[PDB]
Amino acid sequence: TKPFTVPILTVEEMSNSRFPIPLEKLYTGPSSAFVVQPQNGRCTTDGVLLGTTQLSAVNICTFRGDVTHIAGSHDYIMNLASQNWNNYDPTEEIPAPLGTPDFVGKIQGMLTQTTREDGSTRAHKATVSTGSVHFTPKLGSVQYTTDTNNDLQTGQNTKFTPVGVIQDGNNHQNEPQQWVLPNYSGRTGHNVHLAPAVAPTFPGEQLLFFRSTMPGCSGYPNMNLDCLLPQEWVQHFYQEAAPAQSDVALLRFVNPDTGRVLFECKLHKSGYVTVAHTGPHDLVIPPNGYFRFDSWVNQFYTLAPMG
């Protein structure tokens, strides 16, 4: 049978699958207080993409289409196009366009546009509030609060490039909320075709998150962003499409220098990782370490307690 494997990449060599920035560290902690149901960075070890997960790390949280001004303000509405600038098909059995942001927050970036007639271009600071009723990606439209008006033509391809997140008012780090999904259709209807929610079932285990720090653009935003799988694991499983001979793949985080194993963890075929530990812990790892697939085990396997 086609042998299953995980890429030979260190945490630092990989990318966050929920925002286009690199991974930074490994974090584990209880998650019973939240609803862990991210839509980006979801894929079976089998290579089956779930939720809004697509293959490009650079296309996460980006939007394309044309815009129309909202006279009397600095806001604009973007009628979404498919990532390759074609018509957007709402009919697809997906929660929203692949790559759409999967958390409630205010993403700040820039809108860039080119007038097809003369090669005339322009850019403007922009922010998208995914919790806004006007955040309707699934219906094909999103709204941005801009730094201007006047300069942004209609019927012209416009792109939004994400940079980071902002935060307002007291009660610091109150937003964004990485674990609260936005309403892809807004008020028009509930979310559909979602990747299931995730939770560690086996006693004594906690989810292992692949963490990054989204850049802050204003205020005191909660910049922690945890994904369940590095973007290159998604890309790799999709390429390999190796059959799961069990529902849990045993992985060992090894140090290529000392040649020794630091800890071991469970890679669930559904596409998420758990470790044996209780409490919030920032994993201390040798920069050159990487994950290695050792073997398929049953779901009743008890992992050696993580460091």
Ligand X SMILES: CC(=O)N[C@H]1C(O[C@@H]2[C@@H](O)[C@@H](CO)O[C@@H](O)[C@@H]2O[C@@H]2O[C@@H](C)[C@@H](O)[C@@H](O)[C@@H]2O)O[C@H](CO)[C@H](O)[C@@H]1O
Q: Report the partner that residue 58 touches, choosing among ligand X, a copy of itself, none (CB closer than 5 to 8 A by kind).
A: a copy of itself
**What are the residues whose beta carbons fall under 8 Å from the beta carbon of 21, sequence distance 6 or more?**
15, 212, 213, 214, 215, 225
Given the rule CB under 8 A, which of 7-15, 33-41, 88-96, 276-284 is the region that contacts a copy of itself? 7-15
Tokens 């290529």 — which residue?
256
Output 280 or 305, the one with its CB closest to a copy of itself: 280
Would you say 147 and 126 are in contact if contact means Cβ atoms under 8 Å apart? yes
CB of 223: closest distance to a copy of itself in angstroms?
7
Does 218 participate in binding ligand X (rule CB under 6 A)? Answer: yes
Q: Report the C-alpha gap between 38 and 53 in whole angstroms.
A: 10
Q: Is 239 in the site for a copy of itself (CB under 8 A)?
A: yes
**Encoded tokens for 17:** 């699958």
Separation CA 69–CA 77 (nearest Å): 7
Tell me the torsion sign for CA atoms 40, 45, 48, 54.
positive
Region 164-193 residues binding ligand X, contact defined as CB under 6 A: none
| 8 Å CB contact between 289 and 10 | yes
Q: Stretches 3-11, 71-79, 188-196, 197-205: which one binds a copy of itself (CB under 8 A)? A: 3-11
Pairing assessment for the beta strands 290-297 and 25-28 based on DSSP bridges: unpaired
Report the site for ligand X in 58-77 (rule: CB under 6 A): none
As a whole number of angstroms, the distance between CA 58 and CA 20 comes to: 5
Q: CB nearer to ligand X: give 217 or 297.
A: 217
E strand or H helix that includes residue 233: helix 231-240
Site for a copy of itself in 98-127 (CB under 8 A): 108-110, 112-114, 118-123, 125
Is residue 219 at the binding interface for ligand X, with CB under 6 A as the rule? Answer: yes
Size of the site for a copy of itself (CB under 8 A): 52
> Shortest distance, CB of residue 82 to a copy of itself, whole angstroms?
10
Does 151 help bind ligand X (rule: CB under 6 A)? yes
Q: Choose, by CB under 8 A, the member of 48, 219, 262, 288 that binds a copy of itself.
A: 219
With vertex at residue 110, the alpha carbon angle to CA 108 and CA 113, rounded to the nearest 5 degrees, is 155
Among 84, 86, 91, 150, binds ligand X (CB under 6 A): 150
Tokens linked to 130: 């995914």
Supply the minimum distance, in Å, between the C-beta of residue 251 and a copy of itself: 17
CA atoms within 13 A on the CB side of 141: 11
Q: Does 73 bind a copy of itself (CB under 8 A)?
A: no
Return the bridge partners of 261, or none. 254
By CB under 6 A, the residues from 111 to 140 that bind ligand X are 120-122
Q: Are 96 and 52 spatial neighbours (Cβ–Cβ below 8 Å)?
A: yes
| Contact predicate 146/76, CB 8 Å | yes
Point out which residues bind ligand X (CB under 6 A). 120-122, 148, 150-151, 218-220
Point out which residues bind a copy of itself (CB under 8 A). 7-9, 12-15, 20-22, 24, 55-59, 83-84, 108-110, 112-114, 118-123, 125, 159, 161, 163-164, 166-167, 172-173, 215-221, 223, 232, 235-236, 239, 287
